[PDB]
Write a protein that binds this DNA or RNA. Structure first.
Ligand code: NA
Ligand SMILES: [Zn+2]
Ligand SMILES: [Zn+2]
Ligand SMILES: [Zn+2]
Length: 88
DNA sequence: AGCGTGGGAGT
DNA sequence: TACTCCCACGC
């Protein structure tokens, strides 16, 4: 199921796909290909750079679906937490 | 709350 | 492979 093993010392992680292993291995190497042009912070992943950028732009693409609630969020996981809050 | 950081997955 | 999206841990 997860044939791509991480061979770094004392790491037991295994992955379904080669690209998942490559991304994981950036944790060990510290290689960070992406940079925010606003604050120069570096990231190992482009999706992390994308959501970080919303800290500068104020974009909040995720709207609460509860009727009459107008709250918005920069990330889908913030909206999940918020929805969990409406539903006790 | 706000967000760095992470795996699992669709494409 | 890479880009993208989801949900999640932990502060
Ligand atoms: Na990418
Ligand atoms: Zn590893
Ligand atoms: Zn920045
Ligand atoms: Zn709401």
């Amino acid at each position: 199921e997860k044939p791509y093993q991480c061979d770094f010392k004392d790491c037991e992680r295994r992955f379904s796909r080669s690209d998942q292993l490559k991304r994981h291995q950036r944790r060990h190497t510290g290689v960070k290909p992406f940079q925010c042009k606003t604050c120069q912070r570096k990231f190992s992943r482009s999706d992390h750079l994308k959501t970080h950028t919303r800290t500068h732009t104020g974009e909040k693409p995720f709207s609460c679906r509860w009727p009459s609630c107008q709250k918005k969020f920069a990330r889908s996981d913030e909206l999940v937490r918020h929805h969990n809050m409406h539903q006790r």
